[PDB]
Write a protein that binds this DNA or RNA. Structure first.
Ligand SMILES: [Mg+2]
Ligand SMILES: [Mg+2]
Ligand SMILES: [Mg+2]
Ligand SMILES: [Mg+2]
Ligand SMILES: [Mg+2]
Ligand SMILES: [Mg+2]
Ligand SMILES: [Mg+2]
Ligand SMILES: [Mg+2]
Ligand SMILES: [Mg+2]
Ligand SMILES: [Mg+2]
Ligand SMILES: [Mg+2]
Ligand SMILES: [Mg+2]
Ligand SMILES: [Mg+2]
Ligand SMILES: [Mg+2]
Ligand SMILES: [Mg+2]
Ligand SMILES: [Mg+2]
Ligand SMILES: [Mg+2]
Ligand SMILES: [Mg+2]
Ligand SMILES: [Zn+2]
Ligand SMILES: [Zn+2]
Lengths: 63, 109, 136, 94
RNA sequence: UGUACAACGGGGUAUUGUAAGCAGUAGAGUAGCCUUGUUGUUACGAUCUGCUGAGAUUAAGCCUUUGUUGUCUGAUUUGU
RNA sequence: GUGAACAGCCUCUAGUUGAUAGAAUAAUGUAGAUAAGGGAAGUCGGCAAAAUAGAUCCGUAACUUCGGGAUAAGGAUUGGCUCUAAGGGUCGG
């Protein structure tokens, strides 16, 4: 089966979990839960949020 | 018979005050301490050193701390015989954090 | 959903109560779809008849050309914002409620559809899936 | 440590004895008495227990080694890059 | 007197979203001193970076437990 | 102190801490809140609630007893921080 990845937090998404959003054009956003979801509805950037995957790349955290 | 003790307990107040009325919250802690000390050393006669009072109220009625470090002493009752020969006395210990401290017998001297 | 449709469809949550207003995704030149009836429509005291994705509805046009306005016609629901649970386990939803005008059989009034359409609609009405773009 | 010792050696900054440390132009005075009276009034330099000192001409050399080579503030731990830096600062937060 | 129970403490598990403190040739400018700037600096200064997915919270109806301390005989009635 | 403000909100001088208590936390309640998609399809009737609200700027209709209408309608901005400029009095030519 398929384990996706979140379009916000980059977290691991297992089958049936979270929601799958169809944006006003073709776009598809898949959330691991309601946390990463609502954030998206507040228009927040994933690069300014501490714990997301996309952040830990930006700031050279980890590696 | 029972013998004349002292100990140092950390109490979890956070759990015992869970979901109390914000206005009656602190006053519970007073009862939850007297009940707690009738647990250990089932003395049933429990008194509160007014410093401890200032500890329980220091943060206001709604602001009681999560953890207290409490020095409890079992002692003998005097004159005027009460149903008990025996006593209970709780007073504070001034400490940085109530965290990660183990119950300890303070050897009296 | 109704008749004129090819096949059956799995039960999906009803996100369009009667009187709901959704957009028109075709070129018929309508700004609106107003929902006065549904073609499946189980019948019970007090329950509002509810459409969903791929269901047939009888609607009027509040916004648009006067020629398409002020009469009742069949329409179909290709996007709905109230989310549902597909049998594959995923929950999903769209960004709005959209619909396309269609005759009794399900033959499109318009020749094209704007935005993406649910697969649950596209398997039911192949005449829709025809003029469609990317599904789901 | 080798980079800070090579940068301090290439700067050659041994501050002389009668020369005042804390002012920018490094004023020169005729004796060790005159800048030790003058460092007291303008800047506020004071030598604790003047009564007890043996090496007080060498308490001058240990202090000029703080601002001389490694270029350090007497209080802060603040590290200037130049003699100017540590000097400019001592005059700064006072 | 137990593979006993509890109060703490340890882990797991989660919730939030990066603590205090220190440090910083990060920082719009502004005010001082100069060798007057291929990176001149010194002070005041929202914020930012590093220690830091860090601190805090974690059962009150979560999981677990080789640790710390402690509890373990009061009352009443019942007969074919 | 906030602020336009004798508004609301917190504090000082003074004054109370007095209005039966404990234990729980079911239904029904009274007072108070929040709700996915829909948005009056409810109801005799938008009844109740919701939304709008301060300010500074821009814009502002039919009609009018020419005074209004008009905050009409309708748009944008609002923290914190470092700066910049403009705005005065007294005394000596
Ligand atoms: Mg509760
Ligand atoms: Mg009815
Ligand atoms: Mg951080
Ligand atoms: Mg910090
Ligand atoms: Mg806190
Ligand atoms: Mg006032
Ligand atoms: Mg009284
Ligand atoms: Mg009464
Ligand atoms: Mg709702
Ligand atoms: Mg909504
Ligand atoms: Mg609406
Ligand atoms: Mg009606
Ligand atoms: Mg009716
Ligand atoms: Mg009426
Ligand atoms: Mg009303
Ligand atoms: Mg009007
Ligand atoms: Mg307006
Ligand atoms: Mg601004
Ligand atoms: Zn000097
Ligand atoms: Zn210093």
């Amino acid at each position: 089966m398929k384990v996706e990845i979140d379009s916000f937090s980059g977290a691991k998404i297992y089958p049936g979990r979270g929601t799958l959003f169809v944006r006003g054009d073709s776009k598809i956003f898949r959330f691991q839960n309601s946390k990463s979801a609502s954030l998206f509805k507040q228009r927040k950037n994933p690069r300014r949020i501490a714990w997301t995957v996309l952040f830990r790349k930006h700031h050279k955290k980890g590696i | 018979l029972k013998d004349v003790v002292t100990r140092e307990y950390t109490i979890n107040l956070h759990k015992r005050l869970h979901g109390v009325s914000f206005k009656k919250r602190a006053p519970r802690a007073v009862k939850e301490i007297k009940k707690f000390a009738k647990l250990h050393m089932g003395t049933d006669d429990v008194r509160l050193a007014p410093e401890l009072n200032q500890a329980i109220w220091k943060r206001g009625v709604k602001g009681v701390e999560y953890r207290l470090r409490l020095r409890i002493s079992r002692k003998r009752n005097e004159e005027e015989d009460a149903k008990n020969p025996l006593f209970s006395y709780v007073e504070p210990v001034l400490v940085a954090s109530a965290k990660g401290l183990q119950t300890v017998v303070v050897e009296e001297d | 959903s109704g008749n004129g449709a090819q096949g059956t469809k799995f039960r999906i949550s009803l996100g369009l109560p009667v009187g709901a207003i959704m957009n028109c995704a075709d070129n018929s030149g309508a700004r609106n779809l107003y929902i006065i009836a549904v073609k499946g429509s189980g019948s019970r005291l007090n329950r509002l008849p509810a459409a969903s994705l791929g269901d047939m509805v009888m609607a009027t046009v509040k916004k648009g050309k006067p020629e398409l306005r002020k009469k009742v016609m069949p329409a179909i629901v290709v996007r709905q914002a109230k989310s549902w649970r597909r049998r594959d386990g995923v929950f999903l939803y769209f960004e709005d409620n959209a619909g396309v005008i269609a005759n009794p059989k399900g033959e499109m009034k318009g020749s094209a559809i704007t935005g993406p359409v649910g697969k649950e609609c596209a398997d039911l009405w192949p005449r829709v899936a025809s003029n469609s773009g990317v599904v789901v | 440590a080798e980079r800070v010792m090579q940068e301090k050696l290439r700067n050659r900054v041994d501050i002389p004895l009668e020369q005042c440390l804390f002012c920018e132009h490094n004023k020169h005075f005729k004796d060790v008495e005159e800048n030790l009276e003058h460092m007291f009034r303008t800047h506020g330099f004071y030598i604790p227990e003047q009564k007890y000192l043996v090496d007080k001409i060498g308490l001058v050399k240990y202090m000029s080694e703080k601002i001389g080579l490694g270029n350090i503030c007497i209080v802060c731990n603040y590290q200037g890059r130049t003699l100017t830096a540590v000097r400019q600062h001592m005059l700064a937060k006072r």
